Each structure stands twice: as structure tokens, then as C-alpha cells.
Write an enzyme that holds these catalytic residues in place. Structure first.
Site, mmCIF file in Angstrom:
data_model
loop_
_atom_site.group_PDB
_atom_site.id
_atom_site.type_symbol
_atom_site.label_atom_id
_atom_site.label_comp_id
_atom_site.label_asym_id
_atom_site.label_seq_id
_atom_site.Cartn_x
_atom_site.Cartn_y
_atom_site.Cartn_z
ATOM 1 N N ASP A 25 7.142 5.272 -8.110
ATOM 2 C CA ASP A 25 8.348 4.642 -8.619
ATOM 3 C C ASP A 25 9.207 5.561 -9.428
ATOM 4 O O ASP A 25 8.976 5.733 -10.640
ATOM 5 C CB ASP A 25 7.979 3.398 -9.383
ATOM 6 C CG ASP A 25 9.215 2.596 -9.739
ATOM 7 O OD1 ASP A 25 10.326 3.000 -9.339
ATOM 8 O OD2 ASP A 25 9.147 1.561 -10.391
ATOM 9 N N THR A 26 10.246 6.119 -8.834
ATOM 10 C CA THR A 26 11.143 7.002 -9.555
ATOM 11 C C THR A 26 11.991 6.244 -10.576
ATOM 12 O O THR A 26 12.562 6.899 -11.447
ATOM 13 C CB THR A 26 12.096 7.716 -8.586
ATOM 14 O OG1 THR A 26 12.841 6.790 -7.852
ATOM 15 C CG2 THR A 26 11.292 8.585 -7.606
ATOM 16 N N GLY A 27 12.081 4.909 -10.476
ATOM 17 C CA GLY A 27 12.785 4.099 -11.419
ATOM 18 C C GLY A 27 11.971 3.676 -12.628
ATOM 19 O O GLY A 27 12.451 2.857 -13.424
#
Lengths: 99, 6, 99
Positions: A25-27
């Protein structure tokens, strides 16, 4: 490896000796795992996202292997439908976004 | 729809 | 481009003629932008994240330029803590995760 985004980017991780499924999850600033029965000391924290905040337990210096790549760091434990590997560990495995 | 942590 | 993850992967987007900042988010199914008007029809939708569910407006077939790359697809508008570009549009621009 290369992970496309046609489906959720779920991979196998190892934490507390156990293999689990988690989203890369880059967020996510942080790594959020639903594993309510680790040993070890923890401290309370609140983290937020799309619906507001939840209470989690913060565990430090936890080994987390992600697709065979070792990482070690902070893991937050609290209710979540989806285990989440966030940027604190993604950076340790050299993950990048590319387009 | 699930949408991710700050 | 190639984006590392030491910081939040925020980029400039163009939507509805306006410039906005948004997070490239592999952990998001959908693209969610803070409250605004967009052209055309919308219908209510609910989406979830950490913290729970929120109500959003669902706009379909919206052009979005993401760091110079074109996408046309669904944009959800509502009370998100940060503007996020989710997999529905990341796939269109050819984004992958790599390590």
C-alpha cells in the site's frame, strides 16, 4: 518482482513466524495488521484514513518478510479487513512505483 | 470498495 | 517516472480544468477526491477504509491527467483526508509496483 494493479496487490508476508496475506500500500504511512495475539510490549496509537480514526497497538522492531524480502519495523495492530504493508516497510524492500 | 493510512 | 516511498507519493493531477495534488495509492480500489463539483451526472455511493465507511458522489468517465498521463474513469468525491488516485486509474496509466 513486478506487481500490476489489475487486482488488489495482495502478497504473502511472514510476521511472528506466521504466513499471512497483506496489501502492498503506497497510500499507507504505516503497516496495519490484524494480529491481536503477538507477545511483546506495545503502546496505544490512533491512526486515520478514509472513515476516520481507529485505535491500534504499536509494536516496534517486528520482523516482517514480504515476498521473501526481509524488513523490520513498526507494526500497528487493530481491526482491519485487509492487512496493510505501508511505506515504513515498503522502503526497506526497495519498492517503487513505476509508470 | 476499500481504500487505504495517515 | 520512478517514485520511491520515503515520502508520500503525491503528484499533481489535472481534473475538470483544475490542478490538484493527489496520492498514488495502490491500496485504493477507487479514486477519491475532496469535495468539489465535476461536470455531469453523479450518483451516491458508499466506500470504506480504515475508520469505516463514508458517503461519496460517484462521477463516471471523468478525464484525469496524472503526472502527464491520461486516464478517463470513475472519480469519487467526498470527505477523504487526502486526494487519492486508486487502482481504477493507476491501471490506465500503466503503473506497477516493483522491488
Amino acid at each position: 518482482p513486478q506487481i500490476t494493479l489489475w487486482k488488489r496487490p495482495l502478497v504473502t508476508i511472514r510476521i511472528g513466524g506466521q504466513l499471512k496475506e497483506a496489501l502492498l500500500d503506497t497510500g499507507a504511512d504505516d503497516t496495519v495488521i490484524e494480529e491481536l495475539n503477538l507477545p511483546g510490549k506495545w503502546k496505544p496509537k490512533l491512526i486515520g484514513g478514509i472513515g476516520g480514526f481507529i485505535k491500534v497497538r504499536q509494536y516496534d522492531q517486528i520482523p516482517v518478510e514480504i515476498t521473501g524480502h526481509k524488513a523490520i519495523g513498526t507494526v500497528l495492530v487493530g481491526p482491519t479487513p485487509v492487512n496493510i504493508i505501508g511505506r515504513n516497510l515498503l522502503t526497506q524492500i526497495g519498492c517503487t512505483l513505476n509508470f | 470498495s476499500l481504500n487505504x493510512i495517515x
